[PDB]
Structures are given as C-alpha cells and as structure tokens.
C-alpha cells in the first residue's frame, strides 16, 4: 500500500480529523512543507557547524554589528566579507533577499508575470519542466515521488513544530536537545523538564 | 472586489480562500466583534494617552474596596466624577448599574427579551438602521459601499485589538508606549529587538 | 424540551459556533468527555485525599523510584508496595498499564478483532452489549439518558479545560484554588490574581 502511515494525502481519499474544504490547501500545505524541510536542515546543520540556536541566530546579523555571521559558514575559510571591511550588513542582506525572494514568490503565485516562456502555469507546485535538470522526475515514478515529497513535507513541518516548541521550553536548542535525549534517554524529555518546570516553573 | 481590496474577502461578496463563509451567524458575529473592537482599541487608544495607564492594568484601579482612582481620571473634566469628597463610583455601584444596563440592551439587541422600542427594529440584523441611525447616514450614503467600509474597518480594529493583547504579553509597557517606543526609533524598537531581549522571560 | 441549553447534540439540530465536522467527531466528544469525566475526578479525588496537586503528581512515580505513591491512596489499610522493596519501580507498572489501555483501545475500534463476538460492532457511541451489566438506563428512555452523560461529558472537557489552564495560571491545584476562592472571592479571584500576576508579570 501507498501512503499507510496515518490518513491519506490531498490527491486521493479524505482528512481524519479536518473536512479538506477548501483546495487552496494542498499546494499550500506542499510550499510549507518545502520550506520546513529547508528550515529543519538549517536549524539541524548551524548548531552542528557553529554550535548556536536558530532562533538566536537571527541576533548575530543586525543593523549594527552584522559582521558577526561572516565566516559562520563550516568550511569557508574566506568570510562572507572580509574581516574588517565591515561588508555583512543587515540592510544589504534584507533588501538583497527582499528583491530576490519577492521576485521568485512573484514569479511562483503570480503577481508578475513569468519571465520564461516555456509553460510554467501558476499556482501548480509541480512544474517539473525548467525545475528538473536533472530529470528525476520522467526516469522515475512521478506519482510516488510526489508521494515521497509529501511524507517530506509532513515530517519536516512536524519535526519544525516540534523544534519551535522544544525552543520554547528547554531555552537551549535543537541538537543540544537531541544530544542531551541521547546520553540520558530517561533523564532528557519533555516529562523530565516538566518535573523541572521547563524554566519557568 | 473591485471595492473590497483587502486581502481576504467580505461575507457574501465571494469565498474566503481560508476558513470559507459558513453559518451567516458568523457574520453578524463578525460584524458585532469589531464593532466592540472598534470602541476597545480607540478606549486603550485614548485613555493612556489621556492619563497614562495601559489598558490592561486599568481594571485594577477600581476594586471592591476602593474605586476612588477610576475618578477624575478623565483629563479635562470640569469636575469630579461623583463627589470630590467623598467619591461615589464604587465597583459594585458600577456593577449594579452596568450589568443591568449591559444585560438589557444585550438581550433586546437579540431579542430574547421582548423590545421595549417595537419601533420595527429587527433583532439578529447587525444593520438596524433605526433609532441607532439618528443621523441616517446610510441614507443618503450608498449603503452597500458603506457596508464595505464597516467591515474593513471591523477587520483592522480587530487585528489591532490582536495587536494590543499579545503587545501586553510581550512587552508589557502599553499600546501608546509601544508606539512611541517604536517612532522613537524603529530600528532598535520593534518586536525583533524585543524578542532578541527575550521578551521579558528569555 | 430536552437538552434545554446554549447548544444542540449531535443528533438534533446544529452547533452554533464551529461547523459539526463529521460523524467521526460526534463518535470523538463523547470518547473525549468520558475520559474528561474521569481525569477530572481523578484530580478532585487524588487532591482530597493527598493533597498535592495532580499535574505534579507525575514526579512521585519516576523510573528511578515509584515508591512515593506506595501510601498515598486515603484510608488505606496497608500500602500497596511492600514499602521495603519497591517493587512497583515504575517499570511494572508502565508496561502492563500500556498493555492493557493498548489492548483495551484495539478492540474499542476494532484495531483488533473483538474477542467476545458478542454482536457488538466497533465504533459505536454505546455498545451497552456488555457496557450495560445494571441496566437500570438501558431499560427507559434510553435517548435521554444519553443526553445526560452527553452533557456530563461537555461539563467534563470543559472542567478538565479548566483546571490545566488555571494549574498553569496559578501553579497550586484545582481544590486549593477552589478553597482559596470559597474562603474569600472579592480578594481571591481570578482577575485578583491577573492584577497580582498570575506566576508572571
Ligand atoms: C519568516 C521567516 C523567519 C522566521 C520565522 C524568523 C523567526 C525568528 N527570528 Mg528571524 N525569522 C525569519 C526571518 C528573518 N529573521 C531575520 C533577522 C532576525 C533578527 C535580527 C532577529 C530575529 C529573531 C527571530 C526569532 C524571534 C522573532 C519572532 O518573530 O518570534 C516571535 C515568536 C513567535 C512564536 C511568532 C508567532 C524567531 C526565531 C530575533 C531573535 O533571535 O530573538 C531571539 C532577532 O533579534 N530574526 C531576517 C533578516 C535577515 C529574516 C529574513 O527573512
Ligand atoms: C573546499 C572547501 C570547503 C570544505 C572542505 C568544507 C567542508 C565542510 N563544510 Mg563548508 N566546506 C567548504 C567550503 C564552503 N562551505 C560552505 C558552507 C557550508 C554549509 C552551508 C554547510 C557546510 C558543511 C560542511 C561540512 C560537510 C564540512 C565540514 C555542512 C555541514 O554539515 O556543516 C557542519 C553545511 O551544512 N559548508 C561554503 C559557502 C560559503 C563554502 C564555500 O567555499
Ligand atoms: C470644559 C470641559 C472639558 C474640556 C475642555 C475637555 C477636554 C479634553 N478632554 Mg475631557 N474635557 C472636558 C470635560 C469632560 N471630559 C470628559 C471625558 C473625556 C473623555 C472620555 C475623553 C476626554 C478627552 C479630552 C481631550 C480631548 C483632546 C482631543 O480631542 C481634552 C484634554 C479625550 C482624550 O483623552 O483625548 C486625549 C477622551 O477620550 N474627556 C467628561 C465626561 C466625564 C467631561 C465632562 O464635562
Ligand atoms: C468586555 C469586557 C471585559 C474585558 C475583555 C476585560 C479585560 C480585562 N480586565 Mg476588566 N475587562 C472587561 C470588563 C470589566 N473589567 C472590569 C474590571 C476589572 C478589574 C478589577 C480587573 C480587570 C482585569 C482585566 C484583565 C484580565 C486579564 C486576565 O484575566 O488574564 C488574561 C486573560 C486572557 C488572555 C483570556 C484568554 C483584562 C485586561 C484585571 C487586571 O488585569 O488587573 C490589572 C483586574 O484586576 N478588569 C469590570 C467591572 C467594572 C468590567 C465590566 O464589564
Ligand atoms: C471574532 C471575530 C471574527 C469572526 C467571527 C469572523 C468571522 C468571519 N470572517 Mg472575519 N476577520 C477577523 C475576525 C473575525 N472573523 C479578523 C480579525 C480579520 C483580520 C485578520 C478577519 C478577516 C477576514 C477576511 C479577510 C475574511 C473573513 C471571513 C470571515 C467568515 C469566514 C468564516 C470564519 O472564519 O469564521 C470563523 C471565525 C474565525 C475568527 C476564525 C478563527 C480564527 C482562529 C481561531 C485564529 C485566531 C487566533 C486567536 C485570535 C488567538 C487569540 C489568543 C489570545 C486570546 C491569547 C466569517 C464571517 C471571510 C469571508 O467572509 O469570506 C467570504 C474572509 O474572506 N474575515
Ligand atoms: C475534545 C473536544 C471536543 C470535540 C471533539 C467536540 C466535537 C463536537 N462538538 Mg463539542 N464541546 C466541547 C468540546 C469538543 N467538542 C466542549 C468542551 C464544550 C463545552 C463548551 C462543547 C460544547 C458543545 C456544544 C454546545 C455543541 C458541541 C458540538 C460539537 C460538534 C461540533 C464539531 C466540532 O467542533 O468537531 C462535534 C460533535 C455541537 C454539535 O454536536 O452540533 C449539534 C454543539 O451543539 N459541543
Ligand atoms: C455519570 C455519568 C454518566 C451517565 C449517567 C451515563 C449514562 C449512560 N451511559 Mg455513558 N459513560 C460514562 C458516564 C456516564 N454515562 C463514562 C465515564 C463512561 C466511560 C467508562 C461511559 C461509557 C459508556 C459506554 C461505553 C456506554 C455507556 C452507556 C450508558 C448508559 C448506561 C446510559 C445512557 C451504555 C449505553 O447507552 O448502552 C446502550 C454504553 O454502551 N456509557
Ligand atoms: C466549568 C469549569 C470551571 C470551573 C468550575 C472553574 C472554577 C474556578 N476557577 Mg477556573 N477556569 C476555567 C473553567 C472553570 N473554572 C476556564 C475554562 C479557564 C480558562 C479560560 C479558567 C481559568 C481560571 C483562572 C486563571 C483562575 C480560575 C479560578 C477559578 C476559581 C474561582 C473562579 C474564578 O475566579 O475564575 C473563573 C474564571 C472562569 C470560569 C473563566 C471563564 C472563561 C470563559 C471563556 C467564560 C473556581 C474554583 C481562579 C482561582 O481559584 O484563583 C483565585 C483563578 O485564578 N480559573
Ligand atoms: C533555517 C532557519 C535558520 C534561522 O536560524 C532562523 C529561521 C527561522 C530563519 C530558520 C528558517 C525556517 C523556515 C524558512 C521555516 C519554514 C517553516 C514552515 C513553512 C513551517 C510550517 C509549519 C507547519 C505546522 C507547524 C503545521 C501544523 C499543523 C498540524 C499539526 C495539523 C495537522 C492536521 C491536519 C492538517 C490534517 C490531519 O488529518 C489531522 C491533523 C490534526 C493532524
Ligand atoms: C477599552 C478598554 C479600556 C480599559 O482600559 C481596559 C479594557 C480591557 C476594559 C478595554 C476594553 C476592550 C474591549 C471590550 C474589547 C473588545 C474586543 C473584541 C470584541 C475583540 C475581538 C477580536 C477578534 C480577533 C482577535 C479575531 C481574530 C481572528 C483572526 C485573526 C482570523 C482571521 C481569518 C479569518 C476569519 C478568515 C480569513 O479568510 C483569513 C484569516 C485566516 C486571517
């Protein structure tokens, strides 16, 4: 059987829990996902490669003093911008991600016209054409790699529910965390913090 | 629309892309939340910037015991609210009074009591356009668009009354403060630099 | 005039907030409320008799050491664990409470096949086949009766609601917070406690 685990996927049956109303919600629910998975894979590789928090990895790049996240980057020997030139600066990041991601966002869900020519309808989250160099997609299964992507989708939206909440209360991160369950299994949960208050009771 | 702009959607203009229209219950629901909201948000719009006090800790001020400091609160005032000597607007006085005044016109704008008025007024309608139009601006105003401009309105007090509850759980420090915080310097007064303190408990 | 209230039941009539979803989730409330119905008395009565409140109540029986809850049932003519051994030690005791309640569950919903195959069928709101041993409500107005734990139920979410918010509002219990407000409620109250600030501000 395809898709066992719990409920089926919006292409095919009905939600437990939820009516499916509205078909806004599949694609959606498929653009979150990705950006989860992008999300979870950051917050799973800095505090590898750098050892710190990402929901305090926001304060290391600020209007003044942004040069703190040059050279973060494992590997990398050369910084962002070279030390002292002072180059890492909030504004130029913001407006440079603003144009770029406002662009593509654009682009995607149409609020400018696609620059290609080539297909490429809006609002389908699937366009294969242009997005498959490598073409992945026509040498294999198209309906379970779709399937594949979506059990990405759900886990990693689960795994970054997960990690905002165990930021909440364990005040630490989410390595650190799964380091800590790791050792002392028993002695690092949500219950064992629970017996301690999770830091503020 | 070609009116209703605004990102979402107005009930019985269309469909709303999230949670769409459902019972038209929820829309008089609608309706009656902002305008509660509209009157919340212009009262904690008002009042600190009248004496000071943010909205979430003026409840305080009067008590069972005490509710001399409610008076003379109102800048400008001509007089006391109830006597200078021996001020008189105690807690269960604006209970008593309140609950009754509240309770009635809650259940004859509903209807579940008897209407005293039975001026043709149709309980369950969000629009009465009775005594409640005095003025009858709806009447010489084209009253669909004017029904666009309630709602929107309704919506952004709402979200504004969203702003002012989670602003106390965050900052604490008041909805007039928080602006002159943020006007004094955008920059490095913000909900990030907030949240890069901690909002107070990280 | 039955069910003379704020709301309708699943079978007459429509909810007037939130949309009535599903059968699955008329089936779902009344599973939800029993089991509201008893964890709220299960808070009330540990609470009386121990007097320590029931959120905490999960630290007295650790894997390290289950011997805490050796004596703490009231009137009880010898504790339960041999008090010298500790033989509950929390393992015991987890493992045949997850068979059971597992068990238990599987063939409520028909996960596993009923053993008794007594015509009762998976799902239903009210087996009564064998739930019935009394039967002092199976026999007269049957419909009623069910209105009556129906509301028991509602009551029960909503007291169980209750009673994890203010434990998180106040930190104390539910009966000490009861008592604190019965002894004097104009100075112990809950917007007393907002304006003292609940455990914050
Ligand atoms: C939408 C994408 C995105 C999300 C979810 C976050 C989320 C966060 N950022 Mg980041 N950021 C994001 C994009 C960006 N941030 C920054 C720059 C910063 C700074 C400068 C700071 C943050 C901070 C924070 C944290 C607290 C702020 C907040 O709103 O939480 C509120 C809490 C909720 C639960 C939301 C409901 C939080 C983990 C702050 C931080 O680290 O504080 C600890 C901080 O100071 N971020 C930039 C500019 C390059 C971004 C660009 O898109
Ligand atoms: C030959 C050069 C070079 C080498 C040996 C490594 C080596 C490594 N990098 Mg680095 N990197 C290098 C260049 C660069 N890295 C990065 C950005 C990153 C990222 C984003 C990540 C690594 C990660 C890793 C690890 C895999 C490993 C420690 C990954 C890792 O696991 O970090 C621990 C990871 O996620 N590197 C950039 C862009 C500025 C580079 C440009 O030259
Ligand atoms: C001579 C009389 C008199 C004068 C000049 C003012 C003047 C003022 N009052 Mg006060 N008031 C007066 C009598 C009274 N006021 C109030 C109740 C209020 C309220 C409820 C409000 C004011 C507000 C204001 C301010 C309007 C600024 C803007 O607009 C201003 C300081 C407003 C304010 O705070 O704006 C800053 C406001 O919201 N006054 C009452 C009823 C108790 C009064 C009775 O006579
Ligand atoms: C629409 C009605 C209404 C609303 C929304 C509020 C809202 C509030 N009052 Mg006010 N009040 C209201 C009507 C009245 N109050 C008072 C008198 C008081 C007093 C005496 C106190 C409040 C307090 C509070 C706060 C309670 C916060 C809380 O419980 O934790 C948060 C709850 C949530 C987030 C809900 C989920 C909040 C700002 C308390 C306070 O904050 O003191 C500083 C307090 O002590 N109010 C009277 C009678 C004269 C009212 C009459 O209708
Ligand atoms: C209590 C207030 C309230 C009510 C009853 C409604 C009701 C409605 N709105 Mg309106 N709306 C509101 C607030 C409200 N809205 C606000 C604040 C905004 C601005 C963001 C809007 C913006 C808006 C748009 C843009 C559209 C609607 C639409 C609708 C209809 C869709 C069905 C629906 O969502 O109902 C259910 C009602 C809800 C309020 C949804 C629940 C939202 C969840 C619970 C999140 C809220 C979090 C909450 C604030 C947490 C507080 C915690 C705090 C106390 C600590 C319905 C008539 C749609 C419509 O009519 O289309 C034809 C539509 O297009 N509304
Ligand atoms: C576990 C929580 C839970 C669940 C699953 C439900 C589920 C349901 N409730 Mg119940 N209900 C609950 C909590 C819950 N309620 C609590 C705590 C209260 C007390 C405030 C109520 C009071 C309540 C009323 C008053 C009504 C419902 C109704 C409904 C239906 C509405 C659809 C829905 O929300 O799903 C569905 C059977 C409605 C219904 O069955 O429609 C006729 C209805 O009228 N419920
Ligand atoms: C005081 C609360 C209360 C009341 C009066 C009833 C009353 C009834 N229930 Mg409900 N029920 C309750 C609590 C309640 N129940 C709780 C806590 C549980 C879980 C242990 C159940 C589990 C339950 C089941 C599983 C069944 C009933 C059945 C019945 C009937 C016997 C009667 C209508 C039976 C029935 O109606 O059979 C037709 C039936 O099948 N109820
Ligand atoms: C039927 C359910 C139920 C029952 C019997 C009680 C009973 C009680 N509550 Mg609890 N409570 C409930 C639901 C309930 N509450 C819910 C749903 C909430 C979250 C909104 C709370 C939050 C709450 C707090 C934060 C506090 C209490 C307190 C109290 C006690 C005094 C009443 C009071 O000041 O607050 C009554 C408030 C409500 C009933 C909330 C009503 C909100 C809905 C939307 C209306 C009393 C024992 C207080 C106490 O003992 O300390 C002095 C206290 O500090 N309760
Ligand atoms: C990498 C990085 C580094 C920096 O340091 C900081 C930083 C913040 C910039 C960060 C960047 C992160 C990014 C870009 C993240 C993007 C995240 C996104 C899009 C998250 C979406 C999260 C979605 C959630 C929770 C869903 C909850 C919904 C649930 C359970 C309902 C489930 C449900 C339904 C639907 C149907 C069933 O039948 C029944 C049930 C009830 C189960
Ligand atoms: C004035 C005053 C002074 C004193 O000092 C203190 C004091 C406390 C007494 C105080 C008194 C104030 C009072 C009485 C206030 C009344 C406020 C009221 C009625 C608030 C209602 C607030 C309503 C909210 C948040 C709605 C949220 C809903 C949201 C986002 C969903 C939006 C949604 C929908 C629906 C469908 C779309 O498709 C899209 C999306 C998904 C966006």
Redesign the interface.
Known sequence: DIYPEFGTYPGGGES??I?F??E??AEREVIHGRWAMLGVTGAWAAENGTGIPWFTA??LC??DDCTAVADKFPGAVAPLAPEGSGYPSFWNVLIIEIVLVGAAEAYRTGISDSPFDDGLTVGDVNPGGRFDPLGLAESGDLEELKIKELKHCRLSMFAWLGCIFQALAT?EGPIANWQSHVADP?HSNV?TN??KGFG??
């Open positions: 437990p829990i009516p109303g509205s806004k919600n926001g304060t600020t209007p005040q028993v219950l629970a017996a503020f009771y």
